[PDB]
Design an enzyme around this catalytic site. Structure first.
Site, PDB file in Angstrom:
ATOM      1  CG  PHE A   1       3.979   1.757  -9.840  1.00  0.00           C
ATOM      2  CD1 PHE A   1       2.735   2.298 -10.144  1.00  0.00           C
ATOM      3  CD2 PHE A   1       4.558   2.023  -8.618  1.00  0.00           C
ATOM      4  CE1 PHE A   1       2.088   3.106  -9.224  1.00  0.00           C
ATOM      5  CE2 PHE A   1       3.903   2.819  -7.693  1.00  0.00           C
ATOM      6  CZ  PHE A   1       2.672   3.345  -8.001  1.00  0.00           C
ATOM      7  N   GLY A   2       4.222   4.061 -12.045  1.00  0.00           N
ATOM      8  CA  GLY A   2       3.082   4.931 -12.346  1.00  0.00           C
ATOM      9  C   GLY A   2       2.764   5.856 -11.166  1.00  0.00           C
ATOM     10  CB  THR A   3       0.382   8.216 -10.330  1.00  0.00           C
ATOM     11  OG1 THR A   3      -0.841   7.832 -10.962  1.00  0.00           O
ATOM     12  CG2 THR A   3       1.242   8.992 -11.308  1.00  0.00           C
ATOM     13  CB  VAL A   4      -0.125   6.529  -5.152  1.00  0.00           C
ATOM     14  CG1 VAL A   4      -1.168   6.271  -4.074  1.00  0.00           C
ATOM     15  CG2 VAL A   4       0.809   5.326  -5.226  1.00  0.00           C
TER      16      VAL A   4
ATOM     17  CG  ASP B   1       9.566  -3.420  -1.823  1.00  0.00           C
ATOM     18  OD1 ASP B   1      10.634  -2.974  -1.377  1.00  0.00           O
ATOM     19  OD2 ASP B   1       8.898  -2.897  -2.725  1.00  0.00           O
TER      20      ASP B   1
ATOM     21  N   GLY C   1       5.974   6.457  -8.672  1.00  0.00           N
ATOM     22  CA  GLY C   1       7.030   5.474  -8.593  1.00  0.00           C
ATOM     23  C   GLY C   1       7.371   5.056 -10.014  1.00  0.00           C
TER      24      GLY C   1
ATOM     25  CE  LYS D   1       1.302  -0.616  -8.049  1.00  0.00           C
ATOM     26  NZ  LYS D   1       2.337  -1.469  -7.429  1.00  0.00           N
TER      27      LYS D   1
ATOM     28  N   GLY E   1       1.729  10.584  -5.079  1.00  0.00           N
ATOM     29  CA  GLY E   1       3.011   9.953  -5.251  1.00  0.00           C
ATOM     30  C   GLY E   1       3.149   9.353  -6.639  1.00  0.00           C
TER      31      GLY E   1
END
Ligand code: A1H2W
Length: 268
Positions: free
Chosen positions: A20-23, A132, A18, A40, A16
């Site tokens: 913010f970056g990656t998972v 969230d 987002g 993360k 994934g």
């Protein structure tokens, strides 16, 4: 809890992405066994200091939580970027899962959202607000076992207050009127969010307030309107969503009451 980068292996193909970056998927060598992890990893090498602070604060929250319906953090790793290493929930985000598996039975959806309510009841008892709470932030361990993640906006309440007051860039479609109007976040604010999450779950991962800007959602809610009942959704579950969407904070239930309403077995 700082981990040894040498004991972590990461797969190249991200799970994934987002803003913010990656998972990434990985494997972390423990004392004896390897543990499968979701990692993360902050975008662009964690040079953004607000991103990094957000990660450390996210790690600090997760380290304090110990509950079967909350994702467990293994630790943080500062290597090529900064990384938050978590026990892997292999079936992934609830919203995507339901988009792809449209024959999940009502009882099973109720089970999963009840698990989320048990995790949230724990957070409420612990005096943390999640801030969230959305179907995208619920992870499936199995088709019958959900856990909550994504503590990047979460806050430990002050001892003398029942809410966190912000001095944001926010998932407005999940936020209660008092968050929008007064920047106040309580566990009852999280209950509102949970009603949105329930709507998402019974809509097989449709986005809430489709086609609408945040200002239009705020206007709709201030008018006393609410999303309609998902096609096929059990009436009792839609009724519970509308209770979660109680405008007045004092009359909106807390998670102890919501959790009771999602138990599908007899109890007192
Ligand atoms: C198959 C599959 C896909 C994905 C994406 C995750 C997993 N498992 C997994 N297990 C434990 C934890 C997490 C996880 C994801 C995010 C996050 O930061 N997620 C964001 C980006 C991905 C999509 C949703 C979003 N909130 N956090 C803070 N903890 N994930 C499994």
């Amino acid at each position: 809890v700082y981990l040894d980068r040498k004991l972590l292996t990461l797969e190249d193909k991200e799970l994934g992405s987002g803003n913010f970056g990656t998972v990434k998927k990985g494997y972390y060598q423990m004392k004896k066994v390897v543990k499968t992890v979701a990692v993360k990893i902050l975008k662009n090498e964690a040079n953004d200091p607000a991103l990094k602070d957000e990660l450390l604060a996210e790690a600090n929250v997760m380290q304090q939580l110990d509950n079967p319906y909350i994702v467990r953090m293994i630790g943080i790793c500062e290597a090529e970027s900064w990384m938050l290493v978590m026990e892997m929930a292999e079936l992934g985000p609830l919203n995507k899962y339901l988009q792809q598996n449209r024959h999940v039975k009502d009882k099973n959806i109720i089970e999963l959202v009840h698990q989320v309510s048990m995790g949230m009841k724990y957070l409420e008892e612990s005096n943390f607000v999640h801030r969230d709470l959305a179907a995208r932030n619920v992870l499936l361990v199995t088709q019958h076992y959900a856990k909550i993640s994504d503590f990047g906006l979460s806050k430990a309440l002050r001892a003398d207050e029942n809410y966190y007051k912000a001095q944001g860039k926010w998932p407005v479609k999940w936020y209660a009127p008092e968050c929008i109007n007064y920047y106040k976040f309580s566990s009852k604010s999280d209950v509102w969010s949970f009603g949105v999450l329930m709507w998402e779950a019974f809509s097989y991962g449709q986005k809430p307030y489709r086609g609408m800007k945040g200002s239009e959602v705020t206007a709709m809610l201030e008018k006393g309107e609410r999303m309609g009942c998902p096609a096929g959704c059990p009436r009792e579950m839609y009724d519970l969503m509308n209770l979660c969407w109680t405008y007045d904070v004092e009359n909106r239930p807390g998670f102890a009451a919501v959790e009771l309403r999602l138990r599908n077995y007899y109890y007192d």
